């Protein structure tokens, strides 16, 4: 009698791992299968999901994607593969992780920011918080904020996104401010980073 092909890939019985920035139409993994007739393999990808994510070459088992992996839209998935001799066809199921890349920049939300402060507000006075949110993992997803270019008058915690006066302010000289909120990313290698507004009003006090 005949006997049926088997898959022999690792992650059949663990998991592939494909990162999400992988380009559409380059080869993913090749599939592997034996079989004890030496009989020559054709493979395929079975399930519409799969199909429209994978194509695999018959011949070779080698497989594409086929359109855009996104990690922040969905993380994980199963695919069936066969495999087959003359005679009959095998399926196997494979567990897909996405794997994350840094590849949103921080996102600031209720916006425009604007603030109006006393001229004689003193110097370490908290006037404003700002926040970006990023929903990359890791390093990728956490946020440290920074005036661009740094200011002579006002700082921002880099961690919390406080806004705090630094120097003594004088609405004879300035009676406005409009500042870059900076927020950039703490990825290793391309960290990303977005700008924001703050309108800081300053008002006329008598001396
Ligand atoms: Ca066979
Ligand atoms: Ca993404
Ligand atoms: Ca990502
Ligand atoms: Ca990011
Ligand atoms: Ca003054
Ligand atoms: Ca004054
Ligand atoms: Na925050
Ligand atoms: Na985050
Ligand atoms: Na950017």
Redesign the pocket.
Known sequence: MNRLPYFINYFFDTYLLIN?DTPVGSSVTQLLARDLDNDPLVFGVVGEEASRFFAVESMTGVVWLRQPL???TKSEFTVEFSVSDSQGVIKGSVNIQVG?????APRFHNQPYSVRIPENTPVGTPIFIVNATD???GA?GSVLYSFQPSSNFFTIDSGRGIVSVIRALDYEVTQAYQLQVNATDQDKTKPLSTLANLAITITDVQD
Do not use: L
């Not at 994350?100 to 949103?104: E, K």
């Open positions: 999400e996104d990690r922040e994350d890349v840094n590849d949103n929903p990359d993992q990728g």
